[PDB]
Amino acid sequence: MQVPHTESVSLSAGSTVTIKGRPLVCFFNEPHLQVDFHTEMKEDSDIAFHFQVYFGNRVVMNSREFKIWKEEVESKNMPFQDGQEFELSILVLEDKYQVMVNGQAYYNFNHRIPVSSVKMVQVWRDISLTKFNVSN
């Protein structure tokens, strides 16, 4: 699957975004993973949910609203395992996005932009990708 990966989407409460991939290099060198929920197909459009994993280090979450990054949310949760394939499940809940890694929730981000405004998802940085699916 092509990386960067860019897809049109429609999301509502009850949607799940499933992403299966593998880091391209060892964790010691801090590969990244980035998943961005965009308001338009344009790459520089606003971002309702920015999810950036610094593998082996930390996770950063934010929104970009009218071209401006807002309040950063940090996590030190690092359930990802060096060299391993991972399954990310991003659950769209009424109040927040919830990010599961291999079936358990480790990260949460309350909605700042209504989820009905999301029109595109981009998955990119230092991973190979074998699955990207938005639930029906």
Ligand X SMILES: OC[C@H]1O[C@@H](O[C@H]2[C@H](O)[C@@H](O)[C@H](O)O[C@@H]2CO)[C@H](O)[C@@H](O)[C@H]1O
44 binds, among ligand X, a second copy, none (CB under 5 to 8 A by kind): a second copy
Site string (72-111) toward ligand X, x via CB under 6 A: x---------------------------------------
According to CB under 6 A, which one of 62, 90, 97, 123 is a site residue for ligand X?
A: 62
Distances (CA, A) of 57 to 26, 29, 80, 81: 12, 10, 10, 12
60 binds ligand X (CB under 6 A): yes
DSSP designation for 43: T
13 binds a second copy (CB under 8 A): no
Query: From CA 23, how far away is CA 30, in angstroms rounded?
Result: 10
Find out whether 129 and 5 touch, Cβ atoms under 8 Å: yes
Find out whether 34 and 124 touch, Cβ atoms under 8 Å: yes
Query: From CA 4, how far away is CA 94, in angstroms rounded?
Result: 28
- Using the contact rule CB under 6 A, the part of the chain among 35-43, 50-58, 96-104, 108-116 near ligand X is 50-58
Query: From CA 135, how far away is CA 69, in angstroms rounded?
Result: 28
Residues numbered 30 to 49 that lie near ligand X (CB under 6 A) are: 30
CB of 47 to ligand X, least distance (A): 9
25 binds a second copy (CB under 8 A): yes
- The residues binding a second copy (CB under 8 A) are 4, 24-26, 28-29, 32, 36, 43-44, 67, 122, 124-126
